Amino acid sequence: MITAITIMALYSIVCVVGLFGNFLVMYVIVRYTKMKTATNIYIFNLALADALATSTLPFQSVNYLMGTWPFGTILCKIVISIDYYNMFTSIFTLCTMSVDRYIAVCHPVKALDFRTPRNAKIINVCNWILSSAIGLPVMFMATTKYRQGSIDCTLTFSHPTWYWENLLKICVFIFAFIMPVLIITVCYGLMILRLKSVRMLSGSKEKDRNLRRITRMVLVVVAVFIVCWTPIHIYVIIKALVTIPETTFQTVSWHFCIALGYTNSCLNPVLYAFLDENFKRCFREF
Template identity: 40%
Template sequence: MDNLPWNPASPNISCRGQGGSCLPPGGNGTNSTGPGPYPDFYIAIPIIYSVICAVGLTGNTAVIYVILKAPKMKTVTNMFILNLAIADELFTLVLPINIADYLLLQWPFGELMCKLIISIDQYNTFSSIYFLTVMSIDRYLVVLATARSKKMSYRTYRAAKIVSICVWLFVTIIILPFTIFGKIHDDQGRLQCVYVFPSPEILWWKASRIYTLLMGFTIPVSTICILYTMMLLRLRNMRLNTNAKALDKAKKKVTLMVMVILAVCLFCWTPYHLSTIVALTTDIQQTTLIIGISYFITSLSYANSCLNPFLYAFLDDSFRRSFRKLLECRTAP
C-alpha cells in the first residue's frame, strides 16, 4: 500500500496496496510506486519506512524470542501475542522490498514475488484485527467464568495453538482473491506489481474496497465492541449484585493490555479504512496535500507493526522480567 485507495484513473489497472487499489502520486493511475512530481515524498517516505522496518524487526524479534524461550510466558494470551508478533515480523521483513519498489519506480522481482508480497501485505491488514478479535473473545470468556466462579478447563496453551492455526487459515482464505488478482503489468516499458481486475474494472475495484472494509474492519471491530460492551455490563452487575471481585489483579492487567493493544491498532488502521469510504463516495483530486495525507495514513498503518512490542514491555511485568532474565543468561560468562 503506497497511498490511499482513491479511485483508479486508468482502465484495467489498480495500484498495489494493503487491501486494495489507489491512484498514485503521479496522478496518471498507472504507476503504483513512483513519487511523480513530489520529490519531497520520494526522499522522506523511504526513510520513514526504513525506521519502521528497523524498529519493527528488532521489537518483534525480541517478543518472539522471549515468548518461545521463557517458560513462564507460555500462556493463552501470549500465544495470541506471539502470532501477532509473527504477522508483524513477516511484514517488516518484506518492507525493504516495498522500499526498493518505491525507489526504482518499477517492479524488478517477478510475478511470483509480486503475489507473495501482496499476500503478506494483506496478512498485515487482516491478521492483527482477527487475532485481537480472538483475544477479545478470550477475555470475555475469562470474565464470564470468573463471574460464575467456574474453571475453564478447555482454555489451554494447546487449544490456543489450534485457534491460532484456524485464524491463519481463515485469513488465508480471505486474502486469496487479492493474491489471484496480483499481477505484473507492463506500463510503457515499466513493470508494475498491481491488481489487474477483469471488466468492468471499476465495479471490481469498488467490490474489493467494500470487501476489505467489511472483512478487515467493520465485522471484526463490531464483534469486539459488542464483546467489550457485554464484558463491562457483566463487571458492573458483579459489583452491584455480588461481593465477589470482578477479576483478580493479574487478570485485570491482562485485560488492560489487550484493550490498549486493540486501541492502538484501531488508532493506526481506522484512518485507512475511513479513506476507503471517502474513496467510494467522493471524487478526490490528487493535490500535494491529498498525497501528503495519503502517505501519512499509509505510514500510520505500517507503524502498527512496530508499536506492539513497546506495549508489551510497558504493560506486562512478566514480559519485562523474562526479557531481563534471558539477557542476563546470554551475557553471563
C-alpha cells in the same frame, strides 16, 4: 524531492521498529517463557503476523522510490500475498485475544475448559487458514502490468473490474475494520463492566487503582486500533467515491495513512506482550 525522502524515512523507521519489536517478543516468548499458555501462543502468532507483515515494507518503499517494480511478477505476488495474509492474521489474532479475555472474565466456568493450549493452537491454525482463504485470491490476482512506460504491479480482475474491485474494498473495510472494532469494543466493554462488578477489584485503594489499570490498558488498546486504522480506511473509501487529484499533499497523506496501519503492527508487541505482567515478571529477573 524531499517528499520521497520523508516517505522513505517513515517506511524505514516503521519497518525497523516493527521487525525489532516482533523479533525480540518472539525471542523472549521462545527462550525465557514458553508457549505453555493460550495467551503466549496468541502473542507469538501475532508476532509472526506482524513481523512477516512489516517485512514487505522495503519492497513497497523501493517501489515508491523508483516508480518501477523490477522484481518480476513472482516476487510481487509473494510480497503482496504476504502483506494481505499477515495483516489479516494479525487482525484475527487481536480479535481472538479480545474474545479470549472476554470469555476468561465473563464466562469463567466455560473458560476452565475452553482456555487450553491445545484449543489455542487449533484457533491459531484456524486463523491462518481463514487468512489463506482470504489471501489466495491475492495470490491468483496479482500481476505486473505496463503503463506509461513504467512497470507497476497491482491486482487485476475480471471483465467487471469495478465490481470485483469494490468487492475487495468491501471485504477489507468490513472484515478488517468494522467487524474487528465492534468485536473488540463489545468484548472489552463487557469485560470492564464485569471487572467493575468483581469483589477483588473493588472496595479499597489498591484494588481500585488495579481496576483502573486494566481499564486504562483496555482503553489504550481500543484507541490505538481505532486511531491507527480509521484514516486509511476512510481515505480508501473516499478515494473510491470521489476523484482526488494527484498532488504532493495527497501523496504524503496517503503514504502516512498507509504507515499508520503498520504503526499499529509495530505497537501491537508493546501493548500486548510488553505490558503483560507475566512478561514483566520475566523481565524482572534481569
